[PDB]
Design a protein around this ligand. Structure first.
Ligand code: 8RV
Ligand code: NA
Length: 121
């Protein structure tokens, strides 16, 4: 239908907007601590600790299959990345601190992205 096509045009342009947002987000992770899923080879008990793993590679796969229907969903996964890290790793570690910095630098990007999503509808 025309209705379905228009629906998919918005989804596509959402996806274009999210791909940008996701790049700005990785750019704030120069150490690439969150680029890839935590290796179960190197940390074999990880899933005993973290129930829902997330990372940028995984988010990017979902994104390219247009699996993000709105910004709430995308933010949910981004927060998973941060919250998992600040749980699994202790306060005085390089990993925890990298997450706190991503959280803070990221929040700016998501503050404006939320406005662009509303207005562009
Ligand atoms: C995003 C995130 O939580 N990263 C974690 C992955 C595990 N490393 C520690 C590590 C490295 C190598 C071997 C055994 C443990 C850093 C913390
Ligand atoms: Na902890």
């Amino acid at each position: 239908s025309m209705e379905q096509v228009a629906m998919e045009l918005r989804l596509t342009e959402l996806t274009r907007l999210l791909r940008s947002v996701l790049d700005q987000l990785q750019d704030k992770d120069p150490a690439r601590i969150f680029a890839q899923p935590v290796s179960l080879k190197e940390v074999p008990d990880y899933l005993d600790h973290i129930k829902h793993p997330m990372d940028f590679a995984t988010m990017r796969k979902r994104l390219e299959a247009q699996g993000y229907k709105n910004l709430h969903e995308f933010e949910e996964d981004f927060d998973l990345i941060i919250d998992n890290c600040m749980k699994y790793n202790a306060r005085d570690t390089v990993f925890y601190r990298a997450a706190v910095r991503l959280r803070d630098q990221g929040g700016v990007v998501l503050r404006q992205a939320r406005r662009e999503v509303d207005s562009i509808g």
